[PDB]
Coordinates of C-alpha atoms and ligand atoms in Angstrom, one line a residue:
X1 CA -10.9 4.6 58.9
X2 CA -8.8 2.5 56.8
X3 CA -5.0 2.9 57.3
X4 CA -2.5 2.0 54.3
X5 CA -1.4 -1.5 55.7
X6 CA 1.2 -3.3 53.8
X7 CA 1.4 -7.1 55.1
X8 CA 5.1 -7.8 55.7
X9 CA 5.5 -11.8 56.3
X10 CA 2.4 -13.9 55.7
X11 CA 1.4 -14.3 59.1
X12 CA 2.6 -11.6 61.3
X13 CA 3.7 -8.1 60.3
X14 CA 2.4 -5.0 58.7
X15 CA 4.3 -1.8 57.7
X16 CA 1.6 1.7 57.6
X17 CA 2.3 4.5 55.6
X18 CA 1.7 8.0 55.9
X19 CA 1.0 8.5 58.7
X20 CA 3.3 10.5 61.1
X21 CA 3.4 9.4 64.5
X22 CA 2.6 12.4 67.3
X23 CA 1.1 12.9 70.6
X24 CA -1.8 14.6 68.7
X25 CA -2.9 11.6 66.1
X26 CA -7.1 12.0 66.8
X27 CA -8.9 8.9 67.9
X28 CA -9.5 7.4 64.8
X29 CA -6.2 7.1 63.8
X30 CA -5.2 5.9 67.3
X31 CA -8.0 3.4 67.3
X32 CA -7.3 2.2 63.7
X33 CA -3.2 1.7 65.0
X34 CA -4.3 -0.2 67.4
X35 CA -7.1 -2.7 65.3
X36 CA -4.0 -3.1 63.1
X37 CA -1.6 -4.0 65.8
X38 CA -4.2 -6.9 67.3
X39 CA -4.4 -8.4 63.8
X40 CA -0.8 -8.3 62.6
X41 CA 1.0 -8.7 66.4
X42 CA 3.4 -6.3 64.8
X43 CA 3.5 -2.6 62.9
X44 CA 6.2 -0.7 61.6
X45 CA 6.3 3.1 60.6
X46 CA 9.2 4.5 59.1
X47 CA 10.7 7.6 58.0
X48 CA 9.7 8.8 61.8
X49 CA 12.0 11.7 61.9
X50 CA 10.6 14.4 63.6
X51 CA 9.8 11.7 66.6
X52 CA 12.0 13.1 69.0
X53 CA 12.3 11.7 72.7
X54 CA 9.3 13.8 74.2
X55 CA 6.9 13.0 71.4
X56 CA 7.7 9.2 71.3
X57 CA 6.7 9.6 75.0
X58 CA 3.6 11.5 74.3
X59 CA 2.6 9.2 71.5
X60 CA 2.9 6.0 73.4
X61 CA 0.4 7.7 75.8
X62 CA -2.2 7.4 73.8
X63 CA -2.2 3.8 73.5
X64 CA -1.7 3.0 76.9
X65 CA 0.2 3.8 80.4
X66 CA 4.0 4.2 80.0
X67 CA 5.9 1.6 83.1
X68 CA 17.6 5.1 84.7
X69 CA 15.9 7.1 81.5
X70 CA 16.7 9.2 78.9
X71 CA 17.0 13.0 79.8
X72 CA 14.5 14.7 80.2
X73 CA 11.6 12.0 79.7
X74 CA 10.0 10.0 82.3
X75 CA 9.3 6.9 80.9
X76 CA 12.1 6.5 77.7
X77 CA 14.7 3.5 77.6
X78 CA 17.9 3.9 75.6
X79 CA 19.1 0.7 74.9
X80 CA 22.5 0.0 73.1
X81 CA 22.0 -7.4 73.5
X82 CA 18.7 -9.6 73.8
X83 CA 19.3 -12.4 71.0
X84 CA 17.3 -14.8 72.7
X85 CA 13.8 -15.5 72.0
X86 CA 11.3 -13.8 75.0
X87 CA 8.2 -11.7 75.9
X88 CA 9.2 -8.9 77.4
X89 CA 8.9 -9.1 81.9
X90 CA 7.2 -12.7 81.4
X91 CA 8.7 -13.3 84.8
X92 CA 6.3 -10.5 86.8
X93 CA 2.3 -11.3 86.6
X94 CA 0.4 -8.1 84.8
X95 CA 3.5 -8.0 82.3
X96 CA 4.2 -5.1 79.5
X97 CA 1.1 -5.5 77.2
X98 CA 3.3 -3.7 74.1
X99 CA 6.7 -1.8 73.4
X100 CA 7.3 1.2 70.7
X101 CA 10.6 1.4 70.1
X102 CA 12.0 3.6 67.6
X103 CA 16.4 3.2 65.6
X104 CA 18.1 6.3 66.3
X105 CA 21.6 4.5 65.1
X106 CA 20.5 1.8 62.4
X107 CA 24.0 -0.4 61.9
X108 CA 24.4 -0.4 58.3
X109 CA 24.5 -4.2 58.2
X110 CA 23.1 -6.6 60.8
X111 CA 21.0 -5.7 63.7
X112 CA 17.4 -7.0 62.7
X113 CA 15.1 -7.9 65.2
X114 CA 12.4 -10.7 64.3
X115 CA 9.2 -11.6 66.4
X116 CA 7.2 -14.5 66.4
X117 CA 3.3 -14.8 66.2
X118 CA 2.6 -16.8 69.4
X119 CA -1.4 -17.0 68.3
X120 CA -0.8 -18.4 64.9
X121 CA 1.5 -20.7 67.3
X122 CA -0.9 -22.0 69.3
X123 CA -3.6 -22.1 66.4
X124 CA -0.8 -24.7 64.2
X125 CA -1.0 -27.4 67.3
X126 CA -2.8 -30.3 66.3
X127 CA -5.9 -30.3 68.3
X128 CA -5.0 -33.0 71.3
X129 CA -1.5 -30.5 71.5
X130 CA -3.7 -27.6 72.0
X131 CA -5.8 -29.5 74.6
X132 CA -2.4 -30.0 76.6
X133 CA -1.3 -26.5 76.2
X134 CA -4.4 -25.3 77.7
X135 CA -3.9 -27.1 81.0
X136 CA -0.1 -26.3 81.5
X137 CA 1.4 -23.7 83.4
X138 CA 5.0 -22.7 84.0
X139 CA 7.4 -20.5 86.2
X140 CA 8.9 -17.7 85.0
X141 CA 11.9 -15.9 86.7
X142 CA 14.5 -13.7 85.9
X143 CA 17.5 -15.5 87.8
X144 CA 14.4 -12.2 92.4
X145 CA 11.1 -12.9 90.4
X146 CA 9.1 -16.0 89.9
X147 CA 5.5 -16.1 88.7
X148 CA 3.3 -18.9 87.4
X149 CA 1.7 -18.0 84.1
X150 CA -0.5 -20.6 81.7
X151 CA 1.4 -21.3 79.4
X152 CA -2.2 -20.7 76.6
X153 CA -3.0 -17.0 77.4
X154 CA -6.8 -15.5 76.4
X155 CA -6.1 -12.2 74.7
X156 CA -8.4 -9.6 76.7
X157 CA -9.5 -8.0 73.4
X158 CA -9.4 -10.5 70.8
X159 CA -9.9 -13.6 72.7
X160 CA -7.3 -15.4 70.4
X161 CA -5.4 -17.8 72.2
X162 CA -1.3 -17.6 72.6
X163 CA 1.2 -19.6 74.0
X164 CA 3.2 -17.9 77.0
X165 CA 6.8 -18.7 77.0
X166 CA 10.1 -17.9 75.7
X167 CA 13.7 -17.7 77.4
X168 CA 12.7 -16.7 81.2
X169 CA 10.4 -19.8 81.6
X170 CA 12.0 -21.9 83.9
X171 CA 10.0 -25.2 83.8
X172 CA 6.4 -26.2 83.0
X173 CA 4.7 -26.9 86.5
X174 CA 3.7 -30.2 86.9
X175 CA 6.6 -32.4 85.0
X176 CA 9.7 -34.0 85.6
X177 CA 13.2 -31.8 84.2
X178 CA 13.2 -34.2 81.3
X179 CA 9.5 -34.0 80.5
X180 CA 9.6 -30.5 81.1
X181 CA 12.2 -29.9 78.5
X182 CA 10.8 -31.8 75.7
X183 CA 7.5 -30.3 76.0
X184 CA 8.8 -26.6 76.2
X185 CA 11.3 -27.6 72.9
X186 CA 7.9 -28.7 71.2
X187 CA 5.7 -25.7 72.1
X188 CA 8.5 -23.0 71.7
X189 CA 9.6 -24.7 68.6
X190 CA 6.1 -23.7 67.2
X191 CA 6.7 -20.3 67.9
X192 CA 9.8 -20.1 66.3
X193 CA 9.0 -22.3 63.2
X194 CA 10.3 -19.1 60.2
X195 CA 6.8 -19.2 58.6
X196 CA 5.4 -17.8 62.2
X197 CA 7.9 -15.0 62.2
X198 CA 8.9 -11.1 60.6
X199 CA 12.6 -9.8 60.6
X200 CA 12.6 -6.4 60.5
X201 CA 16.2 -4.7 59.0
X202 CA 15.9 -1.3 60.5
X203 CA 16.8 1.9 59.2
X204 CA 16.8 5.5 61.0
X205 CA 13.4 6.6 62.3
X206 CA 11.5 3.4 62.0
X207 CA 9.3 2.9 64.6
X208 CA 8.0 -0.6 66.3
X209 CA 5.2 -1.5 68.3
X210 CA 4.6 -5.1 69.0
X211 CA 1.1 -6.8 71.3
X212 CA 3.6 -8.2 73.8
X213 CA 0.8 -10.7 74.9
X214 CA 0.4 -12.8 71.4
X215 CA 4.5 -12.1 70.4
X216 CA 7.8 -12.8 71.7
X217 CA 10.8 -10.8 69.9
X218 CA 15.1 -11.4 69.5
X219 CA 17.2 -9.2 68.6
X220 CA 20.4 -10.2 66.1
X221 CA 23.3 -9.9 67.1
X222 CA 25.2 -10.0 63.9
X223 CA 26.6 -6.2 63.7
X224 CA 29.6 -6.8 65.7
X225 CA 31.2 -2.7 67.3
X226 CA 28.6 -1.4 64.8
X227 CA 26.8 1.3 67.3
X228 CA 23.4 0.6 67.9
X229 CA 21.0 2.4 69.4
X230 CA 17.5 2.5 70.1
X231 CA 14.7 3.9 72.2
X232 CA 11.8 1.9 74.1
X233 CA 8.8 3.3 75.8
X234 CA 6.8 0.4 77.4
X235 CA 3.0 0.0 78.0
X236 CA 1.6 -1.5 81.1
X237 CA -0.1 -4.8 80.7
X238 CA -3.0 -7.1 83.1
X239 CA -2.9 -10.1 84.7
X240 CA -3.2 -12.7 81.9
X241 CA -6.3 -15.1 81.8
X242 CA -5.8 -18.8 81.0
X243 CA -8.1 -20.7 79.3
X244 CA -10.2 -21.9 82.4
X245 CA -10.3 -17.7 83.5
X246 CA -8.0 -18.7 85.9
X247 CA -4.9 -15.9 86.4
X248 CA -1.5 -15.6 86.7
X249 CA 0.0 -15.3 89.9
X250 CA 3.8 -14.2 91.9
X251 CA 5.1 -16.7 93.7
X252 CA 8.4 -15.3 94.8
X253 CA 9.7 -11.8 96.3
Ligands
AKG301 O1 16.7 -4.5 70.7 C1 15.7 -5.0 70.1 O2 15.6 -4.9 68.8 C2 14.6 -5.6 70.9 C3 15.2 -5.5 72.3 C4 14.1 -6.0 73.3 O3 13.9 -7.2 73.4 C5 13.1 -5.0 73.9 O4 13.3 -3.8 73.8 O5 12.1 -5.5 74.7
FE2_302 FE1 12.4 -7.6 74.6

């Protein structure tokens, strides 16, 4: 089955049209949305506006296992600022593997979000780069967690390599303060480099879903006392696989 995929940026995004997301899409449309989201790291659907809280819920199910919610869901987050570049939980080991997250209040101006293809990333490094990235690991922590994650991640379906890092890597393992900054700046800076990313401007009833293991995502925050709001369900990820098959692990509490 061939959805109607419309490319967004050149090297991450696609928007898909007609269809209408539900917790009763059949498997070939459920398979096809999730080919779709491998390739292009992030897919958009809009004019969602008979997703309601229960059947965002019951849709994400079918891609995955959902992880103070919205009544009466189990799994739904209402959030209403992360303007700092990040895969999401980075600082746990089998982190989210994918968020769908839907505008209920879409400020009129401002409040994009933008995500980064951390595959094409990795891919851009000239070759003795991506030799060095596949032997480097870093902490991540939220300051209690801190895990030690390869900072090149294998992609357990596609195989394509990513980088690993964003704003809760705390320093590359291995490397002086110094060294450990410069190197971070260079392989982040990849990420962030415009032609790897998407801004989405979001209106009412558009729906995301992004492959948190080959993205990292910020939010603007350029909208000021403009209410926004939005609503997450989040998929349970694995333990990711460097390069050499060896796994993340947690090395505090
Ligand atoms: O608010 C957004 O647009 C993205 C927020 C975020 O980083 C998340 O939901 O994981
Ligand atoms: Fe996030």
């Amino acid at each position: 089955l061939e959805l109607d995929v419309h490319p967004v940026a050149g090297r991450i995004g696609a928007e898909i049209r007609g269809v209408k997301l539900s917790p009763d899409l059949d498997a070939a449309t459920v398979e096809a949305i999730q080919a779709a989201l491998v390739r292009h790291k992030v897919i958009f659907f809009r004019g969602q506006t008979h997703l309601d809280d229960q059947s965002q819920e019951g849709f994400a199910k079918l891609l995955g296992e959902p992880v103070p919610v919205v009544d009466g869901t189990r799994y739904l987050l209402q959030l209403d600022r992360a303007n700092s570049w990040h895969t999401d939980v980075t600082f746990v080991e089998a982190y989210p593997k994918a968020s769908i997250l839907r505008s209920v209040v879409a400020p009129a101006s401002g409040g994009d979000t933008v995500w980064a293809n951390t595959a094409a990333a990795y891919q851009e490094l000239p070759e003795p780069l991506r030799e060095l990235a596949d032997k480097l690991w870093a902490v991540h922590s939220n300051e209690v967690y801190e895990t030690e994650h390869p900072v090149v991640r294998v992609h357990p379906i596609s195989g394509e390599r990513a980088l690993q890092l964003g704003h809760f890597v705390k320093r590359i393992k291995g490397y002086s303060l110094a060294d450990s900054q410069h190197l971070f700046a260079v392989l982040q800076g990849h990420v962030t480099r415009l032609e790897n990313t998407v801004r989405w401007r979001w209106e009412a009833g558009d729906v995301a879903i992004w492959d948190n293991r080959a993205t990292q995502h910020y939010a603007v925050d350029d909208y000021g006392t403009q209410p926004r709001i939005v609503r997450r369900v989040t998929l349970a990820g694995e333990v990711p696989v460097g390069v050499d098959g060896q796994l993340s692990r947690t090395t505090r509490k």
